[PDB]
Amino acid sequence: APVNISKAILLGVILGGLILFGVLGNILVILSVACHRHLHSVTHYYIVNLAVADLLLTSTVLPFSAIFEVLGYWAFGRVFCNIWAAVDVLCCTASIMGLCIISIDRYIGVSYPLRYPTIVTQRRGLMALLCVWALSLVISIGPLFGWRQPAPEDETICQINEEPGYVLFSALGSFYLPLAIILVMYCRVYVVAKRELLKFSREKKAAKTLGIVVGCFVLCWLPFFLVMPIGSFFPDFKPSETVFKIVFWLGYLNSCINPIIYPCSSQEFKKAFQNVL
Ligand SMILES: COc1cc2nc(N3CCN(C(=O)[C@@H]4COc5ccccc5O4)CC3)nc(N)c2cc1OC
């Protein structure tokens, strides 16, 4: 259907700029971790895992959301709508468990600096990464593909499951449980760092950087997981759908915010970014 030109063009341009910045940042993070040989570690492997997750979030789901916004309605196939929702959930739920294992690794490193290489070894790190990716896949496409509501008869409609039975499970298994794990691990990290040398300081600095990243992610994605379950469990059903869109976009903004954090909070990452550009 016809829509605005100037406003739509401006909105599309700004959104495209956002995706371009996010993709550039994630690619920069991946290249900085990979090409450099002094940035190899299980923590940096988890960092590139998060970079891949939010790069997928910025490269496929984000452009589709931007195009939907510009058009005002769904234009692609219904199968494409389902795959779009599934990829959105998969990326936003794999990032959270990536942060969970990053928090576990940072707790191990802060608590046991000297013995850190003997606990979180390369093999164990990759095993944990693969387990996280598999569990994120399962949690993402279980409630959706498994318990799927009757399909709408309109090809132009691409909505979100509003049934409480799905929103409760998705919020619990995607945000609230991994979030609780992350808070437990970082409260432990904070207490251990404060109560507690050349390697301990490095672990503390990495923990601070990844804690900033985790805080940004949680702040960005909290409004959505607070408004969706509330909307389903209360007479108010996502009031001001505009605000519902704003909370999704704020959540997506973390995908672009994250690459800024690594240089601005880790001088090693700043040097790597400077010398890779
Ligand atoms: C991990 O976080 C999750 C993300 C999810 N994402 C989707 N999407 C994203 C895109 N999308 C929209 O409807 C959005 C929002 O609503 C709209 C309303 C009117 C106009 C446009 C709108 O754009 C369709 C599919 N679906 C789910 N079930 C999700 C579940 C999750 O777990 C709790």
Author numbering: 19 to 214, 261 to 341
Give verbatim excerpts from the published study on this entry:
Among them, the α1-adrenoceptor (α1AR) comprises 3 subtypes: α1AAR, α1BAR, and α1DAR, which mediate signal transduction via the activation of Gq/11 proteins. Antagonists targeting α1AR have been primarily utilized clinically for management of hypertension and benign prostatic hyperplasia (BPH). In this study, we determined the structures of α1AAR in complex with the α1AR-selective antagonist doxazosin and the α1AAR subtype–selective antagonist silodosin. The complex structures indicate that both doxazosin and silodosin bind to the orthosteric binding site of α1AAR.
Doxazosin is a selective α1AR antagonist that belongs to the quinazoline class of drugs. The structure of the doxazosin–α1AAR complex reveals that doxazosin adopts an inverted L-shaped conformation within the binding pocket of α1AAR, establishing extensive interactions with surrounding residues. Specifically, the dimethoxyquinazoline moiety of doxazosin inserts into the orthosteric site of α1AAR, forming hydrophobic contacts with multiple residues, including C1103.36, V1073.33, T1113.37, F2886.51, F2896.52, I1785.52, M2926.55, and Y1845.38. In addition to hydrophobic interactions, 3 key hydrogen bonds are observed: the oxygen atom of the dimethoxy group forms a hydrogen bond with S1885.42; the nitrogen atom in the pyrimidine ring forms a hydrogen bond with D1063.32; and the nitrogen atom in the amine group forms a hydrogen bond with Y1845.38. The other 2 moieties of doxazosin, the 1,4-benzodioxane-2-carbonyl and piperazine groups, are accommodated by α1AAR residues D1063.32, W1023.28, A1033.29, C17645.50, Q17745.51, F3127.39, K3097.36, F3087.35, Y3167.43, and F862.64, which are primarily located in TM2, TM3, and TM7. In contrast, doxazosin, with its more rigid quinazoline ring, appears to have a suboptimal fit in the pocket, resulting in its positioning more toward the receptor's outer region. Consequently, doxazosin fails to establish the π–π interactions with F2896.52, which are observed for silodosin and tamsulosin. In addition, van der Waals interactions involving residue E872.65 were observed only for silodosin and tamsulosin but absent in doxazosin-bound complex. Conversely, the inhibitory activity of doxazosin was not diminished by these substitutions, highlighting the crucial role of M2926.55 in determining ligand selectivity.
